[PDB]
Design a binder for this molecule. Structure first.
Ligand SMILES: Nc1ncnc2c1ncn2[C@@H]1O[C@H](COc2cccc(CCC(=O)c3ccccc3C(=O)O)c2)[C@@H](O)[C@H]1O
Length: 439
């Protein structure tokens, strides 16, 4: 790509085409640039300049979306913040993130930040469009880190997604996931990348939120919610992510006429890295722009959507390792161009002198049709350091698998105890470890 602010590009190309539904109010691009203009001008009178660090603490609402466009058009570095993050955690994070303003349309409670207010004044206040300008700072989720992205990176993310998921002139993506996550940002950038339509509507049941839309992004529990309510859903495409996506979910969805795409994404990549139409264990081959490789069982990623760095103690620190890749801490395998996530390196533990990857042992056991869930959890052992324990939820009554595993797992991977998953953990690896150490 764009030679001007995305919303102004489409204003010139297709100005009278409808761009946005905000609570059922329809705005074409010309009208949209006009509302953003009023807010961007109001922010500038209150001190927001190119590079200002601004906390946007809020849930998705039409105001929040407009405020984002306005803040960005001023050239600000936007840190959207989940209103549920507690004040003590923010008191720890904020002073290191080089912020001067807070917009909470709640109350600002951080007196080092000047309180911003939605204010309509006259003007077309805009910083000059610059794809390489810093756009956002998204919290990862120890202390959250602030992954920083340029406009260019969000646009590269969008380009890749839209190479898999057709999204065109008439289509309409619901802003279905929070803008304080990369998921909701990705929807906004896909909308703007394509110059299509987005819908933003104050909170109502998801079934109603979806009215008139063609596309949505869901976490798996949102999709389950729709299926259990037997909601009528009429979509071209749903993109799922945030976790592994069970085959049963997508089969149940397919039966309701819901075309699902499954993605592997990360905060550091401003959303989706690998993706596929729902079909197999893998997370699909890398989206165009992205590259994947496995080193010493670790998934490494490279893309134009990668964050410029993490904002540390007032400065930008690069994400990349000595080869120019991001080391994910995810354990993976590549077969036939497709990535499979085996587990998290943070869960690996040692028993004797062997590495037990819980997720691998879990997969083997879970294939037993009596088994609905299995977690493999270390417990302290003098002779061997740790030994695996199975914590199980069975389909009906429990079954003895202590023999059935002996030809499917090596000795060091076989559980030394088989326990039952308690109600307090149905619908956390530390919690399971802690619970097992009291059993
Ligand atoms: N498809 C997978 N298989 C298996 N493990 C996975 C996994 N997707 C993550 N994960 C795991 O969960 C970890 C972190 O996952 C995320 C954390 C923060 C942000 C995100 C991106 C979420 C996302 O961007 C999104 C969510 C809902 C709907 C659409 C989208 C989207 O726009 O792409 C993922 C990964 O490192 C993996 O260990």
């Amino acid at each position: 790509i764009f030679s001007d602010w995305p919303w102004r590009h489409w204003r010139q190309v297709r100005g009278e085409t409808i761009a946005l539904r905000l609570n059922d109010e329809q705005l074409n691009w010309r009208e949209l640039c006009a509302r953003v203009d009023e807010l961007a001008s109001g922010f500038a009178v209150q001190g927001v300049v190119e590079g200002s660090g601004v906390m946007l603490r809020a849930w998705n609402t039409p105001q929040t979306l407009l405020a984002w466009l306005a803040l960005l058009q001023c050239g600000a570095r936007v840190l959207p913040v989940n209103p549920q993050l507690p004040q003590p955690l923010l008191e720890e994070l904020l002073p290191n993130l080089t912020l001067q303003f807070a917009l909470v349309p709640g109350e600002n409670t951080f007196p080092a930040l000047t309180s911003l207010h939605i204010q309509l004044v006259e003007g077309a206040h805009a910083a000059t469009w610059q794809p390489t300008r810093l756009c956002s700072m998204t919290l990862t989720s120890g202390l959250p880190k602030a992954a920083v992205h340029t406009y260019q990176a969000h646009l590269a993310s969008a380009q890749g997604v839209l190479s898999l998921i057709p999204f065109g002139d008439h289509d309409d993506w619901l802003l279905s996931l929070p803008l304080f996550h990369v998921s909701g940002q990705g929807i906004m950038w896909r909308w703007l990348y394509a110059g299509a339509r987005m819908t933003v509507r104050d909170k109502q049941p998801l079934e109603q939120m979806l009215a008139g839309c063609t596309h949505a992004s869901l976490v798996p529990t949102q999709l389950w919610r729709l299926l259990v309510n037997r909601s009528s859903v009429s979509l071209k495409a749903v993109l799922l992510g945030g976790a592994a996506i069970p085959v049963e979910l997508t089969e149940q969805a397919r039966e309701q006429g819901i075309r699902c795409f499954c993605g592997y994404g990360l905060t550091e990549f401003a959303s989706t890295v690998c993706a596929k139409e729902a079909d197999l264990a893998d997370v699909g081959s890398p989206l165009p722009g992205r590259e994947v490789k496995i080193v010493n069982n670790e998934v490494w990623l490279r893309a134009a959507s990668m964050a410029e760095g993490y904002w540390r103690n007032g400065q930008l620190v690069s994400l990349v390792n000595d080869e120019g890749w991001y080391a994910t801490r995810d354990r993976g395998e590549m077969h036939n161009g497709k990535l499979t996530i085996v587990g998290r390196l943070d869960n690996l533990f040692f028993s004797g002198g062997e590495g037990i990857q819980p997720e691998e042992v879990e997969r083997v056991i879970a294939a037993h049709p009596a088994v609905l869930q299995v977690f493999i959890v270390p417990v302290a052992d003098k002779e061997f350091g740790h030994r695996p324990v199975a914590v199980m939820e069975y389909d009906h009554e429990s079954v003895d698998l202590s023999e059935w595993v002996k030809d499917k797992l090596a000795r060091f991977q076989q559980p030394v105890r088989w326990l039952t998953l308690p109600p307090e953990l149905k619908n956390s690896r530390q919690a399971l470890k802690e619970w097992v150490q009291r059993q």
